[PDB]
Design a protein around this ligand. Structure first.
Ligand SMILES: Nc1ncnc2c1ncn2[C@@H]1O[C@H](COP(=O)(O)OP(=O)(O)OP(=O)(O)O)[C@@H](O)[C@H]1O
Ligand SMILES: Nc1ncnc2c1ncn2[C@@H]1O[C@H](COP(=O)(O)OP(=O)(O)O)[C@@H](O)[C@H]1O
Ligand SMILES: Nc1ncnc2c1ncn2[C@@H]1O[C@H](COP(=O)(O)OP(=O)(O)O)[C@@H](O)[C@H]1O
Ligand SMILES: [Mg+2]
Ligand SMILES: [Mg+2]
Ligand SMILES: [Mg+2]
Lengths: 387, 151, 370, 370
């Protein structure tokens, strides 16, 4: 495959994996583990269910599996299941012997330190990687853009987080989590569909509503317009066919679902949504740099892909500088240049950025935490990895 | 809260109908004179019974513009009056001899007469609508859909 | 050739002798990156300087290595000196004899340690280090006058008569643009325009340079601002917000005429002219009033020449004529005068040079640099 | 009798002049319900204030109408004054004159809109708007000092000597018990505890009040906390669920001495106090080292008075005798100070009366008050 560093975005919803200088993930698959179950459902000799089924092998066969997720909110909940993703990732997707390899990992900006420690311990002591580096997921997405300033916001399956950057300095006091992302919009889609009477409360049906959200949802650009189309008109109604063959009608739930990123109170969170979170983050930066942040807001991660999200977010920041800085005076609004970067690749920007960064530091062997350094200092060897 | 404050109206100025259709060159008083000389020719053509030559001459010029409702309405009053005074068996002999430009002026104003039934008799306009579309084809309505909005 | 700089307490200006204006002029600043986290694939300096620090400033702590005209950080001056030579003027210093400056009544060791690094680190053939006021009598075609100067960290009056210094009457005041910026930054809190960061000092310094003026009758101008908005003006910060500045725009420069505004229980800018003129000799005092040149960047305010005229005229006896001389090139005048002196047809023997420094050390500078 | 009402930037304190502690003291909060679904007619209301907001907080969104000592939200601040008068003190305010409190270097428009709405709504007979640090001096029983106030939203130094305050020497910093709670909500993420609601901020405040302390020497406590669980403690949430907390007990208060932990460019409170005394004249500097009075609830941590001394004695010259005055009642010292001041025989002529507000409007407060 390659002799250069391996890179692994072990995301909350998808693992993406490959090597330094890859222009796109070598593989990606759901970060799911399954165990065999029987369920008053179809059975077939067309496939054989092993005791542990993971990644693509599980998601293609999940009618037969008790599906479980090793991660939530960007943290590993169960390491015995994350070991069964990492075994699969290295031994039967990449088909590697990890002994002495160097690997780049990722995690979100405010995780428990016990998560990075036990993730590095596992890399040194199950697999025996020769070197490890862990990067904050949103600073990777800035190397993908070929860029060195402008606030980058990453929204994944687990967490939405923001990292302001100016002239290659990373503003660690302004980095932030919004604990609402692509999974809370999916648990919410199940809860909207339950008002229509459709039940999706089996563990294997969660991937079906992920595929449904990912297919049919869009972010409303103007809520009183989509509420007009929703209440006055049939035009929003769309038929989705489940893998069961059942057809379900979905309507206001197309815009009303991804709206929880802009209004977290719909999912019971008191936090401010994307527009108000990015504004209260840029507007907390020092006076000299705020222009260079509004001139380059960078979107990233799969939950930034909803149709209309770049346009809703740009509008909803022009609309919010207008309330909170101009106090509703139109005279200065045309002077407020805000720009959203919303590139075609952006779902993979954390991986594509990781694959750039893992080239920049492939040969600098002191830059990685080495296995030989881990085995003498333990967890204190990770203090190499910044503030 | 902020969600309802519109900004598109004040940061992204939209097109105007005068960007899509060229503005009228003739001034308001210059068309108000041009119509006020024609309406007496149409009123006279009814009084001498030659109402069909009334329509042929009235239809030789058309007023248009958001500045001229007080004379577009007078032109429409004369046109609906002239349509109400042509015998229904003469209509197929008039329509087959109109140019495609004149036809697209007739059917454009019958859809203005049909917009105001409390001032115009619809029954004779619907009769002209059947005969003008049956003779000259469905595209003559499509040229009305597409036409200038200040006609 | 020769090379001259006013090593300024906030704004360095430098160039070659016989040029009519300085070819390098930049903030007297070393800046350092304020946050621990940097993108690991990309370049940052140890520290930034001049217009590079000024344009980078949002992520920097900014340190002025000169304060009140005293070199406070020699280890940082060694960077801004290097910046004048190798980055702005693009010279090799070992070719060029040099003219430096300092204020009167400076710490004696400042004159010594700048001499020490100019020979031991910048290798120069020769130097001299003149009184900033004396250079600012040059570039006005003059040999008698009471030069009045205000820089960034320094103010002083020097009476010169027919080419002779008068050190009983010389005096220096530690008020200048730095203290006026601190006071403007403080009184802007009164509107709610909170500026606190070393980087925000710079945008408040820009507001001071652009929006301020010296009012002619402060106690009535204050009542004018209370009764009319017609003297309020708008300034746009680098983020695009707009700031309304009113009576605070002339309260700031007033601190020169009323130092008690910053708690300084000391004589005003006009009074220090009188307390030096009326300390000069019994006849020459009668024509210092005809030859008082203004110099240094803080003397650039609009309205200041009219104020300076009326106030010293109220203190002086009205039997004799009074003016004030205020060149439009005011803010460079120390350097313009240095450019003249370092190219003058008798000054080419005046320097200190290595052949004497190698045996006297830096201790020689006090023996011929006044 | 007169009322004294400390406009706490997080904790309101109200009472009658000459009484020795606040008669009522409650959070400066207005809370609104975050749920629209309701048991109809069942006693709900559209705003809960003070202890009604705390006891109901799980269903509310809580917002303080004061931030950094500035009232950001006037339509809600008058609900808090309505509560201080009619529900806590249980009086008609129009019978009693009110002493209010303010931070130094606040927007003058804050003190204007405060004196306006206090006469124009509550119709008090008379009022005054004293600076919090000079109030705290009365409770300390002395005429010389350098009061260090540290509240919920601000911290400030006011050097003061035989009653002459030094307004050029004042320092103010927007770092206080709110920012220490923000930083505790941030660093506790490293344990895997996520706090995000404005209700959970009050849990993180209660943790910070019960378990945090100032390290006497920070990088020695950091080494000690890494060396053993000897330093760890436990807290039980309003859920029966248990929290364990370790070096986070002193990394939180350390922010007050190292503002760079929250990215803010400032001196810590030791260096800020030193730079405030070093801004006073040298005859006064000899005495204010012996009189560092402390005030407000952020000066309340275990170990702060000793570490405040060990830091300020490293900056002060060794010939000086250097003392911190930290009373056991220091949380309320500005209110006890106002209770003393409003009771003085000599103060009763210098209230602003309702009669002289009508002659001038709210801008009278700038001549009647400091
Ligand atoms: N077109 C789309 N429309 C809606 N949602 C999308 C779209 N494309 C991807 N997503 C959602 O993005 C999520 C996966 O994105 P991503 O791989 O960036 O998350 P992750 O990196 O695994 O999560 P995290 O970064 O939080 O650990 C899923 O919820 C998926 O349904
Ligand atoms: N237009 C202006 N009006 C008022 N002050 C000005 C103006 N332009 C520059 N300044 C002041 O000039 C000062 C610099 O003067 P300068 O002569 O360079 O100081 P120094 O003698 O210390 O070298 C700055 O502090 C700045 O505030
Ligand atoms: N015992 C204590 N130990 C530590 N912090 C305390 C203690 N008691 C209260 N606090 C702090 O006191 C602050 C309130 O102080 P206070 O002086 O009343 O502020 P304010 O007057 O401005 O409203 C709270 O933000 C809290 O962090
Ligand atoms: Mg991700
Ligand atoms: Mg100078
Ligand atoms: Mg307080």
């Amino acid at each position: 495959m390659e002799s250069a560093p391996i890179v692994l975005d072990n995301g909350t919803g998808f693992v993406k994996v490959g090597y330094a200088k890859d222009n796109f993930p070598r593989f990606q698959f759901p970060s799911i583990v399954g165990r065999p179950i029987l369920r008053a459902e179809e059975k077939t000799g067309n496939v054989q269910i092993k005791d542990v089924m993971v990644g693509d092998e599980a998601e293609a066969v999940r009618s037969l599996l008790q599906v479980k997720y090793p991660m939530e909110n960007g943290i590993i909940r169960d390491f015995e299941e994350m070991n069964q993703l990492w075994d699969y990732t290295f031994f039967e997707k990449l088909k590697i012997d990890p002994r002495g390899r160097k690997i780049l990992l990722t995690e979100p900006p405010m995780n428990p330190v016990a998560n990075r420690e036990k993730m590095c311990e596992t890399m040194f002591e199950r697999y025996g990687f020769g070197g490890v580096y862990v990067a904050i997921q949103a600073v990777l997405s800035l190397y993908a853009q070929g860029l060195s300033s402008g606030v980058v916001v990453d929204s994944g399956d687990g967490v939405t987080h923001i990292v302001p950057v100016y002239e290659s300095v990373v503003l660690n006091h302004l980095v932030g989590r919004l604990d609402v992302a692509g999974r809370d919009a999916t648990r919410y889609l199940i809860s909207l569909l339950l008002r229509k009477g459709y039940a999706f409360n089996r563990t294997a049906d969660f991937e079906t509503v992920r595929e449904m959200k990912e297919k049919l949802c869009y972010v409303s650009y103007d809520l009183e317009l989509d509420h007009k189309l929703s209440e006055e008109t049939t035009v929003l109604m769309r038929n989705y066919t489940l893998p069961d063959g059942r057809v379900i009608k979905v309507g206001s739930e197309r815009y009303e679902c991804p709206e929880c990123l802009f209004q977290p109170h719909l999912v019971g969170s008191e936090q401010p949504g994307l527009s108000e979170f990015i504004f209260d983050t840029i507007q907390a930066a020092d006076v000299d740099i705020r222009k260079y942040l509004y001139r380059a807001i960078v979107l990233s991660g799969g939950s930034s892909m909803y149709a209309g999200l770049p346009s809703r977010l740009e509008k909803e920041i022009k609309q919010l500088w207008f309330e909170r800085v101009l106090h509703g005076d139109p005279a200065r609004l045309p002077n407020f240049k805000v720009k959203i970067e919303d590139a075609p690749r952006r779902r993979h920007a954390v991986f594509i950025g990781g694959a750039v960064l893992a080239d920049i530091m492939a040969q600098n062997d002191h830059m990685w935490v080495s296995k030989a350094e881990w085995e003498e200092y333990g967890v204190r060897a990770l203090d190499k990895l910044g503030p | 809260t902020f969600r309802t404050l519109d900004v598109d109206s004040i940061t992204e100025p939209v097109l105007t109908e005068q960007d899509i259709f060229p503005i009228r060159n003739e001034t308001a008083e210059q068309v108000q004179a041009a119509v006020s000389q024609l309406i007496p020719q149409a009123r006279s053509a009814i009084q001498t019974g030659n109402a069909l030559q009334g329509l042929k001459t009235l239809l030789s010029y058309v007023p248009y513009g958001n500045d001229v409702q007080e004379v577009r309405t007078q032109y429409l009053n004369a046109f609906v009056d002239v349509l109400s005074n042509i015998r229904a068996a003469d209509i197929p002999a008039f329509v087959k001899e109109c140019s495609t430009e004149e036809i697209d002026n007739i059917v454009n104003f019958i859809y203005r007469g049909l917009a105001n039934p409390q001032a115009y008799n619809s029954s004779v306009l619907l009769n002209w609508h059947e005969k003008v579309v049956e003779i000259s084809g469905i595209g003559c309505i499509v040229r009305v859909l597409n036409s200038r909005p200040d006609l | 050739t020769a090379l001259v700089c006013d090593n300024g307490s906030g704004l360095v200006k430098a160039g070659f002798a016989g040029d009519d204006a300085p070819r390098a002029v930049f903030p007297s600043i070393v800046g350092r990156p304020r946050h621990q986290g940097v993108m690991v694939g990309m370049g940052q300096k140890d520290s930034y300087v001049g217009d590079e620090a000024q344009s980078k400033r949002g992520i920097l702590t900014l340190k002025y290595p000169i304060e009140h005209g005293i070199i406070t950080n020699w280890d940082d001056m060694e960077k801004i000196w290097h910046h004048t030579f190798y980055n702005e003027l693009r010279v090799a210093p070992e070719e060029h004899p040099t003219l430096l400056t300092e204020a009167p009544l400076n710490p004696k060791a400042n004159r010594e340690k700048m001499t020490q690094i100019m020979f031991e680190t910048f290798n120069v053939p020769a130097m001299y280090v003149a009184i900033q006021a004396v250079l600012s009598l040059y570039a006005s075609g003059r040999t008698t006058g009471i030069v009045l100067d205000s820089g960034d960290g320094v103010t002083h009056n020097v009476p010169i008569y027919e080419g002779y210094a008068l050190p009983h009457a010389i005096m220096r005041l530690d008020l200048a643009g730095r203290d006026l910026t601190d006071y403007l930054m403080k009184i802007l809190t009164e509107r709610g325009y909170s500026f606190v960061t070393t980087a925000e000092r710079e945008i408040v310094r820009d507001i001071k340079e652009k929006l301020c003026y010296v009012a002619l009758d402060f106690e009535n101008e204050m009542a004018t601002a209370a009764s009319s908005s017609s003297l309020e003006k708008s300034y746009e910060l680098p983020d695009g917000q707009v700031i309304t500045i009113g009576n605070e725009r002339f309260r700031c420069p007033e601190t020169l005429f009323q130092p008690s505004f910053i708690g300084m229980e000391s004589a005003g800018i006009h009074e220090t002219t009188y307390n030096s003129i009326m300390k000069c000799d019994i006849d020459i005092r009668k024509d210092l009033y005809a030859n008082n040149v203004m110099s240094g960047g803080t003397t650039m305010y609009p309205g200041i020449a009219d104020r300076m005229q009326k106030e010293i005229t109220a203190l002086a006896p009205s039997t004799m004529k009074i003016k004030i001389i205020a060149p439009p090139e005011r803010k460079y005048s120390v350097w313009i005068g240095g450019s003249i002196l370092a190219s003058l047809s008798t000054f080419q023997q005046m320097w200190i040079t290595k052949q004497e420094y190698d045996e006297a050390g830096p201790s020689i500078v006090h023996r011929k640099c006044f």
